Swiss-Prot record, chain A:
GO biological process, one term: response to bacterium
Keywords: Adaptive immunity, Cell membrane, Disease variant, Disulfide bond, Glycoprotein, Immunity, Immunoglobulin domain, Membrane, Phosphoprotein, Receptor, Signal, Transmembrane, Transmembrane helix
Positions on the Extracellular side per record topology: 1-116
PTM comment text: Phosphorylated on tyrosine upon B-cell activation by SRC-type Tyr-kinases such as BLK, LYN and SYK.
Domain free text: The transmembrane helices of CD79A and CD79B chains and two IgM heavy chains assembly in a four-helix bundle structure that appears to be conserved among different BCR isotypes.
Descriptive protein name: B-cell antigen receptor complex-associated protein beta chain
Spans through the membrane: 117-137
Domain (Ig-like V-type) ranges: 1-95
Organism field: Homo sapiens
Function per UniProt: Required in cooperation with CD79A for initiation of the signal transduction cascade activated by the B-cell antigen receptor complex (BCR) which leads to internalization of the complex, trafficking to late endosomes and antigen presentation. Enhances phosphorylation of CD79A, possibly by recruiting kinases which phosphorylate CD79A or by recruiting proteins which bind to CD79A and protect it from dephosphorylation.
Membrane topology of this protein: Single-pass type I membrane protein
GO annotations of cellular component type: B cell receptor complex; external side of plasma membrane; extracellular exosome; IgM B cell receptor complex; plasma membrane
Disease named in the record: Agammaglobulinemia 6, autosomal recessive: A primary immunodeficiency characterized by profoundly low or absent serum antibodies and low or absent circulating B-cells due to an early block of B-cell development. Affected individuals develop severe infections in the first years of life.
Swiss-Prot record, chains B, D:
Species whose genome carries this gene: Homo sapiens (Human)
PTM description: Glycosylation on Asn-61 is required for interaction with Fc receptors and ability to activate the complement pathway. (Microbial infection) Deglycosylation on Asn-61 by S.pyogenes EndoS or Endos2 endoglucosidases prevents interaction between immunoglobulin-gamma (IgG) and Fc receptors, impairing ability to activate the complement pathway.
Part of the intact protein present: 120 to 371 of 399
Superkingdom of origin: Eukaryota
Disulphides: C25-C85, C131-C189
Extracellular side: 1-231
Entry keywords, A to Z: Adaptive immunity, Cell membrane, Chromosomal rearrangement, Disulfide bond, Glycoprotein, Immunity, Immunoglobulin, Immunoglobulin domain, Membrane, Secreted, Transmembrane, Transmembrane helix
Protein's job: Constant region of immunoglobulin heavy chains. Immunoglobulins, also known as antibodies, are membrane-bound or secreted glycoproteins produced by B lymphocytes. In the recognition phase of humoral immunity, the membrane-bound immunoglobulins serve as receptors which, upon binding of a specific antigen, trigger the clonal expansion and differentiation of B lymphocytes into immunoglobulins-secreting plasma cells. Secreted immunoglobulins mediate the effector phase of humoral immunity, which results in the elimination of bound antigens.
Region (CH3) residue spans: 105-211
Membrane-spanning ranges: 232-252
A GO cellular component entry from the record: extracellular region
Name of this protein: Immunoglobulin heavy constant gamma 1
Domain Ig-like stretches: 2-101, 110-206
Record GO terms (molecular function): antigen binding; Fc-gamma receptor I complex binding; immunoglobulin receptor binding
Swiss-Prot record, chain C:
Record organism: Homo sapiens (Human)
GO terms classed as biological process: adaptive immune response; B cell activation; B cell differentiation; B cell proliferation; B cell receptor signaling pathway
Transmembrane segments: 112-133
Interval of the full protein contained in this chain: 33 to 169 of 226
Tissue-level expression: B-cells.
Listed name of the protein: B-cell antigen receptor complex-associated protein alpha chain
Length: 139, 252, 137, 252
């Protein structure tokens, strides 16, 4: 309630663009962004890949833009403002991203049974081509 | 010549115990020849003697202003006793009587609704927060605003407006910056009326969490990933036919 | 503070339960209530659910069907001061877990298949050679 | 002792061009001895002669009541011409004259925001829609409501309340059944003032019903597409090499 981030949960598909916001009054310190993942305990400083992630700032709003999202972007992201007066770090609530796909839940079972059938069918021939011709030679 | 007005207590002094209500008897337009003012304070016929008289003052057009104050009790006003101020003047040929009391009827309690800003108002530099209070009787009420336990001052209230069925309503408006609402601060409307529970209530107003979801996958299906698998199971089929056919001729 | 220690979503299947918790740092004389936020527009106030159950203030929803999705919030007020409020937890009802298949991996199938077809051809050709030079000898 | 009053036109007559404004001078309390009442109208000093007068009748407290009516032009009232009634009787020692006109100042124009019902009120039978109108000057406004081209009638409206910086605001409340709000009808607040463009504006309000939260679109896996463009070329070259070896063996 001096910082305020929005939203609380995003769910886009693969390949699209997301934006995140943080409402503060930018005459007190500078906002920095942080990333916590499923396997973390304390959030870390975020490394910005050039040409894919941007980070911009008005007089009353800070913004993070991520373009072309994929599976290794899933996580929970925070803005943080350090005051010029009391040195009390204030932190926002936290936005969560989850990257989705295009198919439905009935078409995923299809390609799973397809890939398992392909891999088993061409395991059997490799066995048979090393059982059969040696069995012919041993008489 | 002189005029007499009689004024009731405040709508808030009778609702709390750490304040003091009082009724007021005011006589204006007293000439310079007869500045003698005679008061009598009757309560239900019985005349009491603990009022207080303030001294006069000189107006523009040679007139005076006399103020008489009587303190009352908190539960004597809330029942319907009648108050009489009697002014006798040597100039006026007859004494003057005025009476006040509380409006008669069965009380009803109000209903309080806070309302957030319009979405077309968020392109300005100041926004308006609204509190609607409806369905009460009599028309005595008190409405205040605050935030973080400290009061806010930039608000206004309309008069009570008579409704279609013998009751009243009003609204109140607070103006704040766009910065303070957009950053997550919480604001409270506080109401005091006599038919409420312990004479008080509060309601709050602020901003809420959100979601952002994506549409649907039940009509259109896929195709930047199904096309690769349908063009890669084909060459599996042709390849396995050719290599098993090449293994056929070595048997015979 | 404690407002940031609460998760941001919860996956429940149809029929199970859901546990929601409110871990504050006030000295045993607070007052905890639970509130629910809906999706859409034109949607203020929230909806009052109830108080807490144990001495820790836990909310338990039993036999969850699809009319329960939304954001759930708790508020802690101590007497007559102004309240605190947590940041939210989105309850999403997804009946399946990820539909389990017969094997391991996901990107180590695409390379077993293609690292296996070459072994099929090269393991197919030279037995056709060796069965000739054995019998002709 | 007769009493003289003077009354300005209605704020909807002075804004459209198919109605007719008029100002009205009223003289009451004529006693039972003098039936001769003489009126004299003045528009900027020049006496006019297109006035109109209705005959008298006997009143409640043994008096009479006379009404005189004068019609004006539309662009005379919206520019500030003073209007003077002059009253002459026989028992009265002096004529009685009054002047009225429009209030003076730079005009402003109002903003119109419509507000949906509070969501706690959907446990009742009727609901309340709200139109805030703020920021105008002078305080001569007209507000109405409608739906499907037909006019509503169950609305109330506060008096204008003076704001902080010298302009005005008001609210208007319309009460409809819950059945008609829930089904998605469209309701409209219509406003007329002298500083809007062509003296008219509207705003609308509707429900736009609820969403689904479907959950039917299949979260992403870590290695879905990883080298699938490579492994078409492998089964191409493996297929062609298989055809070459099968041809060379089947040749003999």
């Amino acid at each position: 309630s001096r910082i305020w981030q929005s939203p609380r949960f995003i769910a886009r598909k693969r390949g699209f663009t997301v934006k995140m916001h943080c409402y503060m009054n930018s005459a007190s310190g500078n906002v920095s962004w942080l990333w916590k993942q499923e396997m973390d305990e304390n959030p870390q400083q975020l490394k910005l890949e050039k040409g894919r992630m941007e980070e911009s700032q008005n007089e009353s709003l800070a913004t993070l833009t991520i373009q072309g999202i994929r599976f290794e972007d899933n996580g929970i992201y925070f803005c943080q403002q350090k005051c010029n007066n009391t040195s009390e770090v204030y932190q926002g609530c936290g936005t969560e991203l989850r990257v989705m796909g295009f198919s439905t839940l009935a078409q995923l079972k299809q390609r799973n049974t397809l890939k398992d059938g392909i891999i088993m069918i061409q395991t059997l021939l490799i066995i048979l081509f090393i059982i059969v011709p040696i069995f012919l030679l041993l008489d | 010549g002189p005029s007499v007005f009689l004024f009731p207590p405040k709508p808030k002094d009778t609702l709390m115990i750490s304040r003091t209500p009082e009724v007021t008897c005011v006589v204006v337009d007293v000439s310079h020849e007869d500045p003698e003012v005679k008061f009598n304070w009757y309560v239900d016929g019985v005349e009491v003697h603990n009022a207080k008289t303030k001294p006069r003052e000189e107006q523009y057009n040679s007139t005076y202003r006399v103020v008489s104050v009587l303190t009352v009790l908190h539960q004597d006003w809330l029942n319907g006793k009648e108050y009489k101020c009697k002014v006798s003047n040597k100039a006026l040929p007859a004494p003057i009587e005025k009476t006040i009391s509380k409006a008669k009827g069965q009380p009803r309690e109000p209903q309080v609704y806070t309302l957030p800003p319009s979405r077309d108002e968020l392109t300005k530099n100041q926004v308006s927060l609204t509190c609607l209070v409806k369905g009460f009787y009599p028309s005595d009420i008190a409405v205040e605003w605050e935030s973080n336990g400290q009061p806010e001052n930039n608000y206004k209230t309309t008069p009570p407006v008579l409704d279609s069925d013998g009751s009243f309503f009003l609204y109140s408006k607070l103006t704040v910056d766009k910065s303070r609402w957009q950053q997550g601060n919480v604001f409270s409307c506080s109401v005091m009326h006599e038919a409420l529970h312990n004479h008080y209530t509060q309601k709050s107003l602020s901003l809420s969490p959100e979601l952002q979801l994506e549409e649907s996958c039940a009509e259109a299906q896929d195709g930047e990933l199904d096309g690769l698998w349908t063009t890669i199971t084909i060459f599996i089929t042709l390849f396995l036919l050719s290599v098993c056919y090449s293994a056929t001729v070595t048997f015979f | 503070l404690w407002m940031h220690k609460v998760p941001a979503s919860l996956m429940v299947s149809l029929g199970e339960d859901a546990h929601f918790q409110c871990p504050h740092n006030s000295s045993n004389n607070a007052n905890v209530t639970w509130w629910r936020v809906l999706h859409g527009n034109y949607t203020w106030p929230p909806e009052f659910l109830g108080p807490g159950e144990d001495p820790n203030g836990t909310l338990i929803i039993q036999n969850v069907n699809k009319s329960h999705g939304g954001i759930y919030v708790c508020r802690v007020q101590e007497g007559n001061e102004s309240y605190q409020q947590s940041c939210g937890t989105y309850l999403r009802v997804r009946q399946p877990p990820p539909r389990p298949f017969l094997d391991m991996g996901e990107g180590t199938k695409n390379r077993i298949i293609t690292a296996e077809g070459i072994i099929l051809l090269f393991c197919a050709v030279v037995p056709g050679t060796l069965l000739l030079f054995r019998k002709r000898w």
